[PDB]
Design a protein around this ligand. Structure first.
Ligand code: UNU
Ligand code: UNU
Length: 340
């Protein structure tokens, strides 16, 4: 690799480790914000559009219920999420601006991206052309090069976690499954359609699972649907481990070849996990038109720009029941979340 890239990644790791070793804590509080709208929901939390009352800035606030995190055995994962997010810095990662906790909840306040999820745009248009899919894929390749060099595995690549910003670039959100890992890790987590075979088979796995997920994402972007689909998860898992994928006829030969090497069931043969690491992907003929430095510098004109009216527009997100956000008079799970 060019020394310029080596030195960049050395500095990136230095800066990450300084924040990793001394995480920021308790940098705002709930009554600093006005609640605007629910942007998304899950089994143990929600994401809200909020406005800071003194500055007028909008943010997306992820709120996790401590008692539900405990019950759903997500304690370590939520601590990972916040500790990693407060320590990273890359053009295609959403920025965490504040974090704090109270008697009931954990709070992560991040930059609001009004363009919405790639998922919505993909389903609205049907599929992306190869150039369009390649523009997004290149950003994920660089983001994984960054994360993996910090010994981080992402573990939740899917279109819902990729927001499209005002310049049409990706900002990856939701680090709920991200983890700092030297060697292997074992937790069953992710989203079924995107799981690598070695996760399904309960092996000790590594960063190669992210490269598998990139194969799934590129396939889904270019086809309009993911390569392994079924009504039951077990049926999805049978397809994933089988080593069989069918490509639409409109796929280019270069795209098929790249995907066979990312969707390689044998992790020891999968692109991104060989001796040349990420460069087997960056040098593949499907990426021959990609100017990697220009992508990093956000100098490439994007395939499209989401339509939105301003930093408070929620039109690109959908409508959810507006539920109360209660804070108990008594502290819950204090010990479990001491480090948050
Ligand atoms: N009540 C509040 O201050 C609040 C602010 C933001 C989100 C939810 C609640
Ligand atoms: N950062 C955001 O704008 C965001 C929006 C919705 C869900 C998650 C994050």
């Amino acid at each position: 690799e060019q020394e310029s890239v080596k030195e960049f990644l050395a500095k990136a790791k230095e800066e990450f480790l300084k924040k990793w070793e001394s995480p920021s804590q308790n940098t705002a509080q709930l009554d600093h914000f006005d609640r605007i709208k629910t942007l998304g929901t899950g089994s143990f939390g929600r994401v809200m559009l909020v406005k800071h009352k003194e500055t007028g800035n909008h943010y997306a606030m992820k709120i996790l219920d401590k008692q539900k995190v405990v019950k759903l055995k997500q304690i370590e994962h939520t601590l990972n999420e916040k500790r990693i997010l407060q320590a990273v810095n890359f053009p295609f990662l959403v920025k965490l601006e504040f974090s704090f906790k109270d008697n009931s909840n954990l709070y992560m306040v991040m930059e609001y991206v009004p363009g919405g999820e790639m998922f919505s745009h993909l389903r609205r248009i049907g599929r992306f052309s190869e150039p369009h899919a390649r523009f997004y894929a290149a950003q994920i390749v660089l983001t994984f090069e960054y994360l993996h060099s910090l010994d981080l595995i992402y573990r939740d690549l899917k279109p819902e976690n990729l927001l499209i910003d005002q310049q049409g670039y990706i900002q990856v959100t939701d680090f709920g499954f991200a983890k700092r890992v030297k060697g292997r890790t074992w937790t069953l987590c992710g989203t079924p359609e995107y799981l690598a075979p070695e996760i399904i088979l309960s092996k000790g796995y590594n960063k190669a699972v992210d490269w598998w997920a990139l194969g799934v994402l590129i396939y889904e972007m270019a086809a309009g649907y993911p390569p392994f689909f079924a009504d039951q998860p077990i049926q999805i898992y049978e397809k994933i481990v089988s080593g069989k994928v069918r490509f639409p006829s409109h796929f280019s030969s270069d795209l098929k070849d790249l995907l066979r090497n990312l969707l390689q069931v044998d992790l020891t043969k999968r692109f991104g996990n060989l001796k040349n690491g990420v460069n087997d992907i960056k040098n593949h003929k499907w990426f021959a038109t990609t100017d990697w430095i220009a992508i990093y510098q956000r100098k490439v004109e994007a395939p499209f720009i989401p339509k939105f009216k301003g930093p408070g527009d929620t039109s690109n997100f959908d409508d959810y029941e507006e539920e109360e956000i209660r804070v108990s008079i008594n502290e819950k799970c204090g010990k479990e979340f001491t480090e948050f």
